[PDB]
Design an enzyme around this catalytic site. Structure first.
Site, PDB file in Angstrom:
ATOM      1  N   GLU B 370       0.844  -1.180   0.000  1.00 33.47           N
ATOM      2  CA  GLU B 370       0.000   0.000   0.000  1.00 33.47           C
ATOM      3  C   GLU B 370       0.884   1.236   0.000  1.00 33.47           C
ATOM      4  OE1 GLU B 370      -0.420   2.529   2.480  1.00 33.47           O
ATOM      5  OE2 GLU B 370      -2.311   3.424   1.689  1.00 33.47           O
ATOM      6  N   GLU B 371       2.013   1.174   0.713  1.00 28.98           N
ATOM      7  CA  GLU B 371       2.830   2.394   0.859  1.00 28.98           C
ATOM      8  C   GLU B 371       3.438   2.839  -0.455  1.00 28.98           C
ATOM      9  OE1 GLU B 371       2.343   4.248   3.272  1.00 28.98           O
ATOM     10  OE2 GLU B 371       2.195   3.161   5.143  1.00 28.98           O
ATOM     11  N   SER B 463      -9.013   9.524  -1.792  1.00 33.62           N
ATOM     12  CA  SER B 463      -8.204   8.356  -2.025  1.00 33.62           C
ATOM     13  C   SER B 463      -6.947   8.378  -1.147  1.00 33.62           C
ATOM     14  CB  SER B 463      -7.924   8.219  -3.488  1.00 33.62           C
ATOM     15  OG  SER B 463      -6.994   7.199  -3.763  1.00 33.62           O
ATOM     16  N   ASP B 607     -30.123  -6.864  -5.196  1.00 29.91           N
ATOM     17  CA  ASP B 607     -29.325  -6.534  -6.387  1.00 29.91           C
ATOM     18  C   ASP B 607     -29.459  -5.078  -6.772  1.00 29.91           C
ATOM     19  OD1 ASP B 607     -28.335  -9.037  -6.485  1.00 29.91           O
ATOM     20  OD2 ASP B 607     -29.320  -9.661  -8.384  1.00 29.91           O
ATOM     21  N   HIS B 630     -15.928   6.874 -11.263  1.00 31.14           N
ATOM     22  CA  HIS B 630     -17.148   7.246 -10.482  1.00 31.14           C
ATOM     23  C   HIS B 630     -17.454   8.714 -10.848  1.00 31.14           C
ATOM     24  CE1 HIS B 630     -20.016   7.549  -7.083  1.00 31.14           C
ATOM     25  NE2 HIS B 630     -19.733   6.302  -6.733  1.00 31.14           N
ATOM     26  N   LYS B 640      -4.870  14.184  -3.664  1.00 31.62           N
ATOM     27  CA  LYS B 640      -5.392  12.819  -3.744  1.00 31.62           C
ATOM     28  C   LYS B 640      -6.150  12.380  -2.480  1.00 31.62           C
ATOM     29  CE  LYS B 640      -3.738   8.349  -5.308  1.00 31.62           C
ATOM     30  NZ  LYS B 640      -2.588   7.365  -5.353  1.00 31.62           N
TER      31      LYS B 640
HETATM   32  N1  LIG Z   1      -1.355   5.841   2.145  1.00 29.94           N
HETATM   33  C1  LIG Z   1      -0.003   6.076   1.515  1.00 29.94           C
HETATM   34  C2  LIG Z   1      -0.051   5.802  -0.012  1.00 29.94           C
HETATM   35  C3  LIG Z   1      -1.168   6.616  -0.728  1.00 29.94           C
HETATM   36  C4  LIG Z   1      -1.176   6.464  -2.245  1.00 29.94           C
HETATM   37  O1  LIG Z   1      -0.144   6.072  -2.840  1.00 29.94           O
HETATM   38  O2  LIG Z   1      -2.226   6.754  -2.855  1.00 29.94           O
HETATM   39  C5  LIG Z   1       0.404   7.533   1.723  1.00 29.94           C
HETATM   40  O3  LIG Z   1      -0.470   8.399   1.891  1.00 29.94           O
HETATM   41  O4  LIG Z   1       1.599   7.843   1.638  1.00 29.94           O
HETATM   42  N1  LIG Z   2      -3.596   8.129   7.192  1.00 29.27           N
HETATM   43  C1  LIG Z   2      -3.563   8.592   5.786  1.00 29.27           C
HETATM   44  C2  LIG Z   2      -2.124   8.597   5.244  1.00 29.27           C
HETATM   45  C3  LIG Z   2      -1.559   7.183   5.002  1.00 29.27           C
HETATM   46  O1  LIG Z   2      -2.241   6.192   5.223  1.00 29.27           O
HETATM   47  O2  LIG Z   2      -0.409   7.048   4.573  1.00 29.27           O
HETATM   48  C4  LIG Z   2      -4.508   7.774   4.891  1.00 29.27           C
HETATM   49  O3  LIG Z   2      -5.499   7.219   5.334  1.00 29.27           O
HETATM   50  O4  LIG Z   2      -4.286   7.687   3.685  1.00 29.27           O
HETATM   51 ZN   LIG Z   3      -1.259   2.885   5.865  1.00 30.80          ZN
HETATM   52 ZN   LIG Z   4       1.194   4.951   5.308  1.00 29.26          ZN
END
Ligand SMILES: N[C@@H](CCC(=O)O)C(=O)O
Ligand SMILES: N[C@@H](CC(=O)O)C(=O)O
Ligand SMILES: [Zn+2]
Ligand SMILES: [Zn+2]
Ligand SMILES: *[C@@H]1O[C@H](CO)[C@@H](O[C@@H]2O[C@H](CO)[C@@H](O[C@@H]3O[C@H](CO)[C@@H](O)[C@H](O[C@H]4O[C@H](CO)[C@@H](O)[C@H](O)[C@@H]4O)[C@@H]3O)[C@H](O)[C@H]2NC(C)=O)[C@H](O)[C@H]1NC(C)=O
Ligand SMILES: *[C@@H]1O[C@H](CO)[C@@H](O[C@@H]2O[C@H](CO)[C@@H](O[C@@H]3O[C@H](CO)[C@@H](O)[C@H](O[C@H]4O[C@H](CO)[C@@H](O)[C@H](O)[C@@H]4O)[C@@H]3O)[C@H](O)[C@H]2NC(C)=O)[C@H](O)[C@H]1NC(C)=O
Ligand SMILES: *[C@@H]1O[C@H](CO)[C@@H](O[C@@H]2O[C@H](CO)[C@@H](O)[C@H](O)[C@H]2NC(C)=O)[C@H](O)[C@H]1NC(C)=O
Ligand SMILES: *[C@@H]1O[C@H](CO)[C@@H](O[C@@H]2O[C@H](CO)[C@@H](O)[C@H](O)[C@H]2NC(C)=O)[C@H](O)[C@H]1NC(C)=O
Ligand SMILES: *[C@@H]1O[C@H](CO)[C@@H](O[C@@H]2O[C@H](CO)[C@@H](O)[C@H](O)[C@H]2NC(C)=O)[C@H](O)[C@H]1NC(C)=O
Ligand SMILES: *[C@@H]1O[C@H](CO)[C@@H](O[C@@H]2O[C@H](CO)[C@@H](O)[C@H](O)[C@H]2NC(C)=O)[C@H](O)[C@H]1NC(C)=O
Ligand SMILES: *[C@@H]1O[C@H](CO)[C@@H](O[C@@H]2O[C@H](CO)[C@@H](O)[C@H](O)[C@H]2NC(C)=O)[C@H](O)[C@H]1NC(C)=O
Ligand SMILES: *[C@@H]1O[C@H](CO)[C@@H](O[C@@H]2O[C@H](CO)[C@@H](O)[C@H](O)[C@H]2NC(C)=O)[C@H](O)[C@H]1NC(C)=O
Ligand SMILES: *[C@@H]1O[C@H](CO)[C@@H](O)[C@H](O)[C@H]1NC(C)=O
Ligand SMILES: *[C@@H]1O[C@H](CO)[C@@H](O)[C@H](O)[C@H]1NC(C)=O
Ligand SMILES: *[C@@H]1O[C@H](CO)[C@@H](O)[C@H](O)[C@H]1NC(C)=O
Ligand SMILES: *[C@@H]1O[C@H](CO)[C@@H](O)[C@H](O)[C@H]1NC(C)=O
Ligand SMILES: *[C@@H]1O[C@H](CO)[C@@H](O)[C@H](O)[C@H]1NC(C)=O
Ligand SMILES: *[C@@H]1O[C@H](CO)[C@@H](O)[C@H](O)[C@H]1NC(C)=O
Ligand SMILES: N[C@@H](CCC(=O)O)C(=O)O
Ligand SMILES: N[C@@H](CC(=O)O)C(=O)O
Ligand SMILES: [Ca+2]
Ligand SMILES: [Ca+2]
Ligand SMILES: [Cl-]
Ligand SMILES: [Cl-]
Ligand SMILES: [Zn+2]
Ligand SMILES: [Zn+2]
Lengths: 691, 691
Positions: B370-371, B463, B607, B630, B640
């Site tokens: 995710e990161e 997002s 549905d 969407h 974002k």
């Molecule tokens: N949640 C991470 C990744 C978000 C993303 O790449 O959209 C951040 O905010 O850094």
């Molecule tokens: N807490 C924030 C930043 C992150 O997750 O990195 C989010 O929900 O996106």
């Molecule tokens: Zn996270």
């Molecule tokens: Zn994070």
């Protein structure tokens, strides 16, 4: 009983005949008052017949018409600028119709205006390969020439696109006796052949599934934002006009330059079929001049939409749809189809009046503007796309019921093969010499499958008719069936001519209306099974079988270039793996389908069957063709009428040895293999156990 | 009984604490062996806990890492080229962790390599409006400058995009005490504030929903065709690196040129916050030099996918998903979330062992990478898109359960509002002063709705987390809930720092793990209702209410330009009409939902509820953002993290007075109004009677 036999027995040849007569006395050109009146008549009768609701759905779409006071024609012009020969301003009308008004003269719908003057080049059928032969082999340059092409073999819109890309400044389309005059049969009105004054109308767009050129993606409703004409989808950039073979002969007879390269370039007229450019010695200073003054105009069109609500699954839709607009009288195209739909509605309505309803909802459609680019079906499907997406079981098309009197012709998704074999085994053959035999027997005998020994032939769906948006854009299982001749993409001789009348059909094609009746039984029977069978009548195993055939075929095309496959590491292993997995998983799903009183499992399983065609859709579409989203099938890029299998890989491989950067070209082949293998696997996984 | 109360009562704060401790002892960086080992541990325990199946789904995706032997840093360099100041090579590790290996040093993931040298310009938060203020008002030119920006307010990827388009040759990101140091609280390890040596890691991509930069549209499986790096999606073209405020102060203190334009440009350090370019007089010949040697490399990642098969509707999926990969120890982000998921699985599994199953299938996900850009959730959803399309009821996210200890924070689709109000009314508040009161009461008191008097605030989904592919691409109803502070898009002080540890949470955020428990009850309770309620717990009327609010809001933005609306005939009447129709039809559907023993009508109706979020998807996507489909919601083009309503019209109107061709610009506003009105009407019609 209210069963399929009851439905089938209620259909009458005599009714279809009455309806055809009724639908063909005056022209019903899209966007005209007469076609709006026919729509209201159909709406009224469908209500009378017993449907639950019948509405008109209207759209304001781009159409094209000749200028009534400034007629289209072509000349040969001398060096003084005297027009020494002119093509006809209209077809001689048929006996008894010489006082019908509002017969639209022959024209190519959506041609731009212009008066280009130039030398002729004859381009055979104007196919991709004809232009390859001209430019590459014969070294003939079409840039700034007027091209003359014969009709036949491919959709006329592809001819025009091909001429445009060859640099032509205009296109003349004509019907050659070789393609539109059957040996030993007489000209209309004494037989079913094309007379020398007959002309085929037809649009020359390259819409690639867009619908109305001004509103791609969205219905052309009353608040629609329209593209400006310069950004419209699929309009030709050069003038185009069709003519008959009397006029064509006058244009071809003086042609000089190079001889035709071989006999496949020669039609049946008494001319050399020289490719040109220009005329022989004496006439070298003469030129051809087109005069085209047609206009495009946003015009209201009307679909009739009839609903027969399902007793048990009202949110599952089986659609029977076909068009109503015609070029002139529509004696075959489309009213031979529409008359059959009308009788099918009548029979379903009779059963409804006695208290029966189908299990699933049936929608019946009378589409407008099919002749101008599938506009009516496409706009309505754009409007209703979410409903169709999630609820569309199947679409059965219903254009012309006959194009000959020889045997059945069926194009459909592999998901409907078994339904069609089974139904045709239960229907009587209408064929001479097969009395007492099934339609399956006579069809299989007259049209044997080449790929599958002992079966009748079933073709791929291409496009060029109203199933396109449902199948290639939306991924709803589709089919079509008609009687046909023993030239498959060329049309019958009187196709889109003034001579296509009720009398043509009654006298020469189907006097007893037994072929129309057989086709009403096939179309209506398919709709009945689809709307009433407890388990959807789709066999996923038939998809597995054709996927293997298409994989072998596309691999074999690539294997014509073994050095490049080596150099760029081009493997089809992923695609064959996905097809193998689809085969295995489909076989297991079939077993479960046999082996499950539980309606959730049933509907769960019926949903898996319904969404299986849907699984072949790629939401990103095919390259530069965003409305063709089906990964297994698309209309051929060289002929909209023909279906192509694995179209993304096929187009990537097409003419690949000519690409300037082979690394990039083969990279894109590999990309398309990955997309195809992925989609096949993903489709397979929709049939796995759901959790 | 096996009911929601049984589920909720089985959740234990003590378990969540044990799991958090377990998940946070060593780093779990995406693509590393340690994170693969944690995935296998989670897979084993989920099996132990009672799930029917638990698999790893792996993908080979583009990641980014610093070069171990060639470290990233920034210098101030004199005219001789002597580096007279260097930024830190690592954060001072926290007490007791000074011997942990494999702590990735601070870096901006996906930065290109380079060693650019130049003069600094300070750009505040590097927001769109900050660059407008610089270029338009102050006349300062960023072309060929190194920009230094403070973190906060918007997603750091938007900052980098903005700097790039301003012509910067590199970007330095830093944490200002104004944004990351709460007054009167101590620095880690004695409080929860950011020390001067702390640094926020984080990717700087602009993927717009694509997933893995090399495989947009398709899963990065073992036969995937990959784009070359030059065609990858969303990579920055200039080097970028983050630093702490001790290092930032050294870079800012010598800044000359223009004063900051106003106090909103000044942080809390003892520097003037001059915008530059370059340093004041004495140091005018000094420059800043970046040294970035990070590499992008295709790396295997692993999602854990757990299945609890539904008893009655196994082909309907309720998904609880959150990520597992962390920048370092992940004490809050994500393991505070993952520990809650782990306990939720344990409780559902306990009920399963006693013979219970949910009505619908529940899928549990531990997402990887995710990161690095939501890569794990996005690839898995690309692989499974057809299943999710047709079967996905809801997605509940599960990143960090706490970012503060003040009150609840909920972002979700309007379809889940009533579910959330009702559930929070049945949960106990964990807040001091609200003992014996409901979570609804304390949340509503601490976070009152501004739009809807007397309700708690619920925000739009933007997002920047793993729900993006499910909601903005696929149209599956989504939600998220966490405890928060009283700076909403900036992060808590220790966000993405080495200092985000188990001890941070246990000592300073949630010693009794009561906030984690409350959040497990909210997330787990939502999943329980969604998976077990006979009628899906979605209220379409809540969508009608917000659609009207968003229509008013977008109209009000347009109405700042009344002359142009007059000149170009810009009407919102169609959109207000569609919203009115949606309101009416939703109200009628609600009545039928109240007024129907029939499981077909029930599932037909369920549905309709499930496909209602789906109806807002446009298969053509938003302009130049094909993965944001969407039409009601998209991540803001300027941030974002923030959701924007009617994003297509909003972006068409944004900064419109600056467009060179107003006719074209207002035409595109009108187009977006038509798309929005059409989609709202089409969504409404999915709720009409089906036949
Ligand atoms: N949640 C991470 C990744 C978000 C993303 O790449 O959209 C951040 O905010 O850094
Ligand atoms: N807490 C924030 C930043 C992150 O997750 O990195 C989010 O929900 O996106
Ligand atoms: Zn996270
Ligand atoms: Zn994070
Ligand atoms: C058709 O269905 C079958 C399932 O029956 C499916 O087989 C799958 O194939 C993939 C790809 O070939 C297998 O992937 C392997 O998975 C293991 C982990 O389970 C990995 O360790 C393997 O990776 C190693 O080896 C690779 C290949 O040389 C190296 O490139 C890589 O770097 C690793 O060292 C590899 O990813 C998968 O396990 C099977 N599943 C099975 C057999 O159950 C097949 O993919 C389906 N076809 C299509 C087109 O989807
Ligand atoms: C919200 O729901 C309502 C349904 O309650 C829906 O109302 C529909 O509005 C359309 C467009 O305004 C109406 O369209 C008319 O239909 C008739 C035929 O039924 C036509 O004759 C009309 O066209 C004439 O007038 C036009 C407008 O000035 C001219 O431009 C045109 O050239 C014709 O002369 C017109 O098309 C439709 O009848 C109603 N349906 C009703 C009231 O039941 C509304 O459209 C929905 N909102 C959205 C955004 O979809
Ligand atoms: C085609 O058949 C229709 C339906 O019978 C005929 O339309 C009817 O005409 C009668 C006599 O003029 C009217 O009283 C009815 O109102 C019409 N019914 C409709 C429109 O549903 C129509 O005239 C026939 N057309 C031709 C050319 O024979
Ligand atoms: C072909 O049609 C054109 C157009 O009607 C005819 O040419 C016209 O002839 C009249 C009378 O001779 C002239 O006054 C017009 O100026 C002509 N118009 C043009 C554009 O040339 C022509 O005679 C017809 N040719 C034949 C062989 O019938
Ligand atoms: C076409 O007809 C065949 C033969 O009747 C059908 O196949 C049979 O279906 C029944 C019910 O599932 C099975 O018990 C038989 O074993 C099947 N026989 C076979 C496969 O040879 C087939 O289902 C029909 N196709 C349809 C309805 O689409
Ligand atoms: C986190 O908890 C897990 C699960 O209990 C621990 O993993 C187990 O370790 C024991 C002792 O080494 C082994 O016998 C088991 O095979 C492991 N079970 C698994 C992986 O499912 C793990 O050691 C704990 N980690 C920390 C840092 O405390
Ligand atoms: C900042 O770091 C650089 C790189 O380590 C240091 O500069 C190096 O110093 C050594 C010994 O004086 C030289 O032999 C190298 O050539 C230098 N490299 C470069 C790129 O300049 C520098 O001393 C450090 N500066 C401070 C203030 O600590
Ligand atoms: C939230 O709770 C309310 C109040 O209990 C629910 O609304 C009631 O639902 C029942 C069952 O349909 C109706 O008979 C009542 O009249 C409703 N009361 C109202 C609207 O005030 C509501 O359905 C719940 N929301 C959910 C479950 O999403
Ligand atoms: C038909 O032709 C004449 C001559 O150009 C023109 O003035 C008239 O407007 C035309 N009708 C059209 C273009 O619809
Ligand atoms: C054909 O003729 C045009 C126009 O004279 C010329 O520009 C073009 O290059 C020619 N094409 C070829 C393939 O010779
Ligand atoms: C109808 O069938 C007969 C017998 O084969 C054939 O001779 C005739 O050509 C057919 N008519 C048409 C229009 O095909
Ligand atoms: C790390 O840096 C050195 C110096 O450029 C390089 O040779 C080595 O390959 C690098 N590792 C990478 C690029 O993965
Ligand atoms: C900023 O500087 C660059 C490079 O010197 C120059 O080309 C560009 O035009 C400048 N931009 C403005 C808006 O002055
Ligand atoms: C926890 O709550 C208390 C009481 O409001 C507050 O003073 C403290 O700052 C909170 N801790 C965090 C990390 O927000
Ligand atoms: N069926 C009509 C229209 C086909 C199309 O526009 O695709 C024809 O072939 O002329
Ligand atoms: N009969 C052909 C040609 C046409 O309909 O115009 C078709 O099915 O498309
Ligand atoms: Ca359209
Ligand atoms: Ca991908
Ligand atoms: Cl047909
Ligand atoms: Cl979250
Ligand atoms: Zn037709
Ligand atoms: Zn036709």
């Amino acid at each position: 009983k209210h069963n399929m036999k009851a439905f089938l027995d209620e259909l009458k040849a005599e009714n279809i005949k009455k309806f055809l007569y009724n639908f063909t006395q005056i022209p019903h050109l899209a966007g005209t008052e007469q076609n709006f009146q026919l729509a209201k008549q159909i709406q009224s009768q469908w209500k009378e017949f017993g449907l639950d609701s019948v509405e008109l759905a209207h759209y304001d779409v781009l159409l094209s018409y000749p200028n009534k006071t400034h007629p289209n024609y072509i000349s040969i012009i001398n060096e003084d600028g005297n027009e020494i020969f002119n093509t006809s301003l209209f077809e001689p009308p048929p006996p008894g119709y010489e006082n019908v008004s509002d017969i639209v003269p022959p024209f190519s719908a959506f041609s731009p205006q212009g008066m280009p003057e130039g030398d002729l080049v004859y381009v055979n059928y104007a196919r991709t390969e004809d232009f390859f032969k001209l430019e590459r082999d014969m070294k003939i340059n079409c840039s700034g020439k007027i091209v003359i092409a014969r009709y036949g073999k491919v959709f006329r819109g592809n001819k025009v696109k091909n001429a445009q890309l060859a640099g032509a400044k205009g296109v003349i389309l004509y019907s050659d006796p070789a393609d539109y005059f059957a040996p030993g049969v007489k000209s209309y009105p004494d037989g079913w052949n094309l007379p020398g004054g007959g002309v085929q109308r037809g649009n020359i767009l390259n819409l690639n599934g867009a619908g109305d050129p001004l509103t791609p993606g969205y219905p052309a409703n009353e608040y629609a934002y329209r593209r400006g004409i310069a950004e419209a989808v699929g309009l030709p950039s050069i003038p185009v006009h069709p003519i008959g073979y009397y006029d064509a002969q006058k244009l071809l007879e003086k042609m000089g330059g190079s001889a035709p390269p071989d006999s496949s370039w020669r039609g049946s007229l008494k001319v050399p079929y020289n490719v040109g450019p220009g005329f022989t010695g004496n006439f070298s200073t003469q030129k051809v001049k087109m005069h085209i003054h047609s206009t495009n105009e946003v015009t209201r069109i009307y679909n009739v939409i009839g609903t027969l609500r399902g007793a048990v699954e009202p949110d599952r839709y089986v659609i029977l749809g076909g068009h109503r607009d015609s070029w002139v009288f529509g004696g075959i195209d489309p009213q031979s189809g529409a008359a059959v739909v009308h009788e099918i509605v009548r029979s379903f309505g009779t059963l409804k009046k006695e208290g029966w309803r189908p299990r699933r909802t049936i929608l019946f459609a009378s589409w407008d503007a099919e002749e101008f680019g599938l506009l009516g079906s496409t706009e309505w499907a754009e409007e209703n796309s979410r409903l169709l997406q999630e609820r569309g079981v199947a679409y059965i098309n219903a254009d012309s019921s006959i194009e000959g009197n020889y045997t059945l012709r069926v194009d459909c998704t592999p998901l409907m093969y078994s339904l069609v074999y089974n139904l045709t085994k239960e229907l009587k053959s209408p064929d001479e010499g097969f009395e007492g035999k099934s339609l399956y027997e006579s069809w299989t005998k007259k049209s044997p499958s080449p790929e599958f020994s002992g079966m009748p032939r079933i073709s791929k769906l291409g496009s060029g008719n109203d199933f396109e948006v449902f199948f290639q854009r939306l991924g709803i299982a589709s089919g079509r069936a008609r009687y046909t001749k023993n030239n498959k993409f060329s049309g019958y001789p009187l196709y889109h001519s003034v001579y296509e009348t009720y009398e043509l059909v009654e006298k020469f094609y189907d006097p007893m209306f037994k072929y129309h009746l057989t086709v009403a039984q096939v179309r209506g029977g398919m709709v009945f099974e689809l709307a009433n069978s407890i388990v959807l009548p789709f066999d996923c195993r038939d998809y597995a079988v054709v996927l293997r055939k298409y994989a072998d075929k596309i691999y074999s095309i690539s294997m014509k270039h073994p050095q490049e496959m080596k150099t760029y590491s081009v493997s089809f292993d992923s695609l064959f793996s996905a097809v193998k997995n689809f085969t295995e998983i489909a076989s297991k799903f079939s077993e479960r389908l046999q082996d499950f009183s539980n309606p959730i499992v049933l509907r769960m399983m019926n949903d898996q069957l319904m969404f299986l065609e849907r699984a072949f859709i790629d939401p990103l579409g095919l390259p530069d063709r965003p409305f063709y989203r089906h990964v297994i099938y698309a209309p051929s890029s060289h002929n909209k009428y023909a279906g192509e299998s694995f179209p993304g890989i096929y187009d990537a491989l097409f003419d690949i040895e000519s690409k300037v950067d082979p690394s990039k070209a083969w990279g894109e082949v590999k990309r398309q293999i990955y997309v195809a293998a992925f989609t096949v696997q993903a489709a397979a996984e929709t049939l796995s156990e759901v959790a």
